[PDB]
């Protein structure tokens, strides 16, 4: 029951995202989705393909 | 953006990934489109050419 705005990744710094961006890449913010459940985990990130 | 099926894009223009203009020269938010794999004999299981 929220907004789930994407103002955080507008400017950002580097990053790679999920590399799909099906609708409006780098714009998004057009679909509501059920929730923004974000599990807590940290990885090295070099093996981003896996 | 993604390509139409059976396309061949040989453009070498620089990328402007942000609001900062690139003016056709490398810099912040200005990354070259082409990168080389660098194939060498001792590569991984799924890294050979």
From Swiss-Prot, chain B:
Organism lineage: Viruses, Riboviria, Orthornavirae, Pisuviricota, Pisoniviricetes
Gene label: S
Included stretch of the parent chain: 459 to 507 of 1273
Species whose genome carries this gene: Severe acute respiratory syndrome coronavirus 2
Function recorded in the entry: Attaches the virion to the cell membrane by interacting with host receptor, initiating the infection. The major receptor is host ACE2. When S2/S2' has been cleaved, binding to the receptor triggers direct fusion at the cell membrane. When S2/S2' has not been cleaved, binding to the receptor results in internalization of the virus by endocytosis using host TFRC and GRM2 and leading to fusion of the virion membrane with the host endosomal membrane. Alternatively, may use NRP1/NRP2 and integrin as entry receptors.
Residue span of region Receptor-binding motif: 1-49
Effect of residue 19 to N: In strain: 20A.EU2, Iota/B.1.526, Omicron/BA.1, Omicron/BA.2, Omicron/BA.2.12.1, Omicron/BA.2.75, Omicron/BA.4, Omicron/BA.5, Omicron/BQ.1.1, Omicron/XBB.1.5, Omicron/EG.5.1
Disulfide bonds: 22-30
Result after altering residue 2 to K: In strain: Omicron/BA.2.75, Omicron/BQ.1.1, Omicron/XBB.1.5, Omicron/EG.5.1
Protein's name according to its UniProt entry: Spike protein S1
Domain of life: Viruses
Outcome after substituting residue 40 to R: In strain: Omicron/BA.1, Omicron/BA.2, Omicron/BA.2.12.1, Omicron/BA.2.75, Omicron/BA.4, Omicron/BA.5, Omicron/BQ.1.1, Omicron/XBB.1.5, Omicron/EG.5.1
Subunit organization: Binds to host ACE2. RBD also interacts with the N-linked glycan on 'Asn-90' of ACE2. Cleavage of S generates a polybasic C-terminal sequence on S1 that binds to host Neuropilin-1 (NRP1) and Neuropilin-2 (NRP2) receptors. Interacts with host integrin alpha-5/beta-1 (ITGA5:ITGB1) and with ACE2 in complex with integrin alpha-5/beta-1 (ITGA5:ITGB1). May interact via cytoplasmic c-terminus with M protein. May interact (via N-terminus) with host bilirubin and biliverdin, thereby preventing antibody binding to the SARS-CoV-2 spike NTD via an allosteric mechanism.
């Amino acid at each position: 029951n929220c907004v789930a705005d994407y103002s955080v990744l507008y400017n950002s710094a580097s990053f790679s995202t999920f590399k799909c961006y099906g609708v409006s890449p780098t714009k998004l913010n057009d679909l509501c989705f059920t929730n923004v459940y974000a599990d807590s985990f940290v990885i090295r990130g070099d093996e981003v393909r896996q | 953006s993604n390509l139409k099926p059976f396309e061949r894009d040989i453009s070498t223009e620089i990328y402007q990934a942000g609001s900062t203009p690139c003016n056709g020269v490398e810099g912040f938010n200005c990354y070259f489109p082409l990168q080389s794999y660098g194939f060498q004999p001792t590569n991984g299981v799924g890294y050979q050419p």
